[PDB]
Design an enzyme around this catalytic site. Structure first.
Site, mmCIF file in Angstrom:
data_model
loop_
_atom_site.group_PDB
_atom_site.id
_atom_site.type_symbol
_atom_site.label_atom_id
_atom_site.label_comp_id
_atom_site.label_asym_id
_atom_site.label_seq_id
_atom_site.Cartn_x
_atom_site.Cartn_y
_atom_site.Cartn_z
ATOM 1 N N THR D 57 0.861 -1.170 0.000
ATOM 2 C CA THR D 57 0.000 0.000 0.000
ATOM 3 C C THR D 57 0.910 1.235 0.000
ATOM 4 O O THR D 57 0.597 2.260 -0.613
ATOM 5 C CB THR D 57 -0.907 0.026 1.249
ATOM 6 O OG1 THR D 57 -0.097 0.068 2.432
ATOM 7 C CG2 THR D 57 -1.795 -1.214 1.291
ATOM 8 N N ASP D 58 2.045 1.121 0.688
ATOM 9 C CA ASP D 58 3.006 2.217 0.772
ATOM 10 C C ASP D 58 3.502 2.537 -0.636
ATOM 11 O O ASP D 58 3.737 3.692 -0.979
ATOM 12 C CB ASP D 58 4.188 1.823 1.660
ATOM 13 C CG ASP D 58 5.186 2.957 1.848
ATOM 14 O OD1 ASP D 58 4.878 3.918 2.587
ATOM 15 O OD2 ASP D 58 6.281 2.895 1.251
ATOM 16 N N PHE D 153 -46.375 19.709 -0.407
ATOM 17 C CA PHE D 153 -46.450 18.272 -0.214
ATOM 18 C C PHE D 153 -47.811 17.887 0.332
ATOM 19 O O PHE D 153 -48.111 18.090 1.514
ATOM 20 C CB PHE D 153 -45.355 17.790 0.743
ATOM 21 C CG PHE D 153 -45.290 16.295 0.873
ATOM 22 C CD1 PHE D 153 -44.957 15.506 -0.222
ATOM 23 C CD2 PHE D 153 -45.598 15.673 2.080
ATOM 24 C CE1 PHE D 153 -44.931 14.118 -0.122
ATOM 25 C CE2 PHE D 153 -45.575 14.288 2.191
ATOM 26 C CZ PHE D 153 -45.242 13.510 1.084
ATOM 27 N N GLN D 213 -39.202 13.885 -4.260
ATOM 28 C CA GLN D 213 -39.103 12.851 -5.289
ATOM 29 C C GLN D 213 -39.229 13.445 -6.689
ATOM 30 O O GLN D 213 -38.507 13.068 -7.601
ATOM 31 C CB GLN D 213 -40.202 11.791 -5.109
ATOM 32 C CG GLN D 213 -39.965 10.765 -3.995
ATOM 33 C CD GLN D 213 -40.477 11.228 -2.630
ATOM 34 O OE1 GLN D 213 -40.574 12.427 -2.365
ATOM 35 N NE2 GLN D 213 -40.798 10.273 -1.755
ATOM 36 N N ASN D 239 -34.068 15.223 3.156
ATOM 37 C CA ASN D 239 -35.050 16.294 3.304
ATOM 38 C C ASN D 239 -34.755 16.901 4.685
ATOM 39 O O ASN D 239 -35.197 16.370 5.704
ATOM 40 C CB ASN D 239 -36.471 15.721 3.268
ATOM 41 C CG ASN D 239 -37.543 16.800 3.093
ATOM 42 O OD1 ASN D 239 -37.241 17.985 2.957
ATOM 43 N ND2 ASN D 239 -38.802 16.384 3.092
#
Ligand code: AZA
Ligand code: AZA
Ligand code: AZA
Ligand code: AZA
Lengths: 287, 287, 287, 287
Positions: D57-58, D153, D213, D239
């Protein structure tokens, strides 16, 4: 053996408020995170459980929203109304601390009621009332800045624990956190904040840095010199290290181009830049 | 008019140190987040950019790791060693502030060199030196607690903004954040920390609370009465509201069982409990 | 040209629930962070704004508290009840995802109604329903572990960009994030969670590590081998680098004692350990 | 049953890179948070501790900085170079996942080498190579938006647990988190990102919302309709409830002006808007 109740305060913390101004089709937004705390004689409340003087934190919360209904010109004005209300409205209430964070919003393509949040900085305001006197500290935080050059650091002491190499070209990155104390409430809070912010950015950007301590001084200096209503300005600046990565192992060089931005640790440079003569230990910094 | 450099300090913050004691097969772990800042004559550094007095933040960092090699018995002991080194090691350095967080680890099934972090609380320690003056403040934080009952709140004032209903049975939850000042450097730092922790926890649970303020007074009173080495203890306790949900609209009752744990806002009750006659405002609390 | 609505789901996320069980003086606490989302036919809601099929997120929230009144034996039982309610209760709702984080609490000295929060780990559960089938994935996260020895890493290939040095004694620290899918709902959720948790800790501690990949593998094998009700276990383990500090510049050696705990970057080792002949593409892992 | 190693990947995560382009006095700043993980044959590393195939990884980290030295036109172009390098450079490495967060900076007064961070949004890029296939998903996050009106809504079902009232005027606030997958790597990555962003903001602000939505559907559709190179766009929109405070108990009305910005819980409306006939299960969406 003998116990005594010392300093104390209580109230409702982080009341998130959004005030929309819509008497016209051109809506305005004011987004705050308000904190209210009262100081006074709450001796019985602590030592006996006698809540007779305890103005419910819930009630302080309601007051915030109730006052919000009437609208406010600035965050500082809103805070001044709250502090005056609780101190004068109650005998045992001799003062308190009222603070708020202000979050900015930008219209989406100049829309009348559609906005996007501007998260590049957060404005702060703190009001502390003590009996007959009151004080306001405005501020700014979370504003990250960086110079890719025009900064050096050398000539520092070298002891047996020193390995840092001197340099005349490095990156200087920090998060601007500054708070200034006003010497009068009669201030155009909005205009000053805008001006101070500009001064901070300008000083930081135009000053050829020989040290973060130096840049901060120039920043604090530009503000003091520009606003007579400001007695002192305190800043806390982290030296967010950007290490020039070593690429020789890969057969390359690194002419101040590729950096690794480390999280921790970081240098923390802090200082108070005050007006000669002005107080040097105001109670409002005690928090 | 004339601009002046006021209070100021600088150093390296959040140096993450892990010290493993492995001279025996029974490894020990010490985990710290160390911050070191120096105080002294840094006038020229700020005003002219002359760094002759600026012991590099990088150097303060190297010093922490170098000093860790020798080991240390307690966090406070470790901080004390750094403070004396810097103050004594430089004539323009007259003091400073060295703080640390200590993170706890538990062995995995009593394993000799395998552990898991205990995140239920974080221990803190701060050392401040001003010339010959040395002050140490130890504390605990992030310890969340809750009483499902044995707590009430009533008898509080009622103005046109008060809606809060009186109650004799509610949940009392908070995050224990406490810091106490030692009046002497000769303290069994670890024994006292464990003691105080137990005293704060005991007082929180056993006190039939009539207000968060009362529970806090008792928590501190217990600490002072038990430890002669402590002049005061400061606590910042949020009243993390657990709202009993109203299920009557659905035809069900809620016998103090179903709650909604709110994030913000929250009440914030703070107080200082001190030994009678002790200093009122030690500078260490200003930071 | 032709735009289409694909995968979709909606609901109420992070409903904080605290259920106190007090039919006796010995109170019990259940602390959850519930998220409910529904799946099915919501075409018109998205395309025409016709909300006839939209069971309000607010309703889903109310439903969590309403059901909470009856109590529940485990977090999984609670999620199963919710999913069942929403899928059968609404024709167009054919599925959903119901997740929860469980927070642990410890009694303060065995007190009957006073507890302190144990933050050393967090239990999770997710229920996914699709038509007549349902799957449950349980897990643990936030449990930090560290081996001061018994770990090595050598034998890796080397290319022009490799600089890492081999080692037979290093620190191995990580955060255990494990999620396992049950192949049936007939399970003793609490006991299996306690078991898995134990198997993960023991495997990590006792495996003489030649790599994080190898350790993670033994941890998964142990789980699969011990519980028949588990078809697979996934783990995401960061390699939290602890650099042995170079003290030679300060005239000191470092016999694997002093370390710098870097935040970023970090190795990230992830894998799936499954029972031979078990599904490898279960939908529950997609969301 | 026997145990088997399923899907797996490993690498270095969150490598913080800052690339300064300074061939002229007009410096440029590229700021990334890079993650590189490899996929291929790592059976032996997990099952046997044989690291012959484990490109450290190094090492992956080193390659990131080394490649950054040559500079890159865009974040996507940078990930493609890294991806091809590891897959083509190692026979046992058949693919991988490379991702990045791009942070924005604005010049301070158009200064040549001083900048301030624009934290109002974060750009993301993810590359996944599977054999000869190169899949790229670009996205944006942390972009908070709000409409103070132009949102309603109603028409939702009122089951036995529904208390939410119908409304024709409310605040609609969310954090725009969007990700779109390119059907080809032949893209002017910077131009499309700016366009997509513009499209999302426009649809959000200008659509008279009947539900989050609906708003989301229009945002996605505008993007799919405008860019042929995009097969699909996924969005996760919370929301963020702004409750109109009830001030009637205080004898005042509240004409959609005073709100309480609640943290949790919150609605979470997510959906995928795609081009008809395009793949709906691309692997890249599983990580
Ligand atoms: O600007 C700086 N100030 C300091 O005090 C310091 N120490 N190291 N680098 C530094 N840079
Ligand atoms: O314990 C409490 N103290 C307070 O000051 C308060 N205000 N509301 N509820 C409260 N509870
Ligand atoms: O836009 C919305 N969508 C929903 O699904 C919902 N549920 N409650 N409020 C809501 N608002
Ligand atoms: O355990 C390890 N696994 C790896 O994949 C790796 N890469 N560098 N160091 C490492 N250590």
């Amino acid at each position: 053996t003998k116990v005594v109740l010392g300093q104390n305060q209580y109230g409702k913390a982080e009341v998130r408020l959004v005030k929309v101004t819509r008497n016209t089709a051109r809506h305005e937004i004011q987004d705050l995170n308000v904190t209210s705390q009262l100081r006074g004689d709450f001796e019985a409340a602590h030592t006996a459980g006698d809540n007779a003087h305890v103005v419910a934190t819930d009630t302080q919360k309601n007051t915030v929203y109730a006052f919000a209904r009437d609208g406010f010109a600035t965050t500082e004005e809103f805070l001044l109304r709250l502090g005056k209300h609780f101190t004068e409205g109650f005998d045992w209430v001799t003062g308190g601390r009222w603070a708020a964070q202000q979050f900015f919003w930008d219209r989406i393509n100049d829309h009348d009621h559609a906005f996007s949040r501007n998260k590049s900085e957060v404005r702060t305001a703190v009001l502390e009332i003590s009996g007959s006197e009151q004080a306001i500290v405005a501020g700014i935080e979370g504003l990250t800045v960086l110079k890719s050059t025009g900064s050096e650091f050398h000539g520092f002491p070298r002891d047996k624990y020193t390995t840092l190499q001197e340099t005349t070209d490095r990156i200087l990155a920090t998060d601007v956190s500054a708070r200034w104390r006003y010497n009068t409430v009669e201030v155009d809070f909005d205009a000053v904040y805008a001006s101070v912010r500009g001064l901070l950015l300008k000083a930081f950007a135009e000053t050829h840095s020989l040290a973060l301590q130096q840049t901060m001084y120039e920043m604090g200096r530009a503000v003091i010199e520009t606003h007579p209503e400001i007695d002192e300005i305190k800043m806390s600046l982290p030296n967010k290290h950007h290490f020039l990565v070593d690429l020789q192992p890969f057969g390359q060089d690194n002419p101040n181009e590729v950096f690794y931005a480390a999280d921790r640790p970081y240098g923390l440079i802090e200082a108070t830049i005050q007006r000669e003569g002005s107080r040097a230990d105001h109670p409002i910094w005690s928090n």
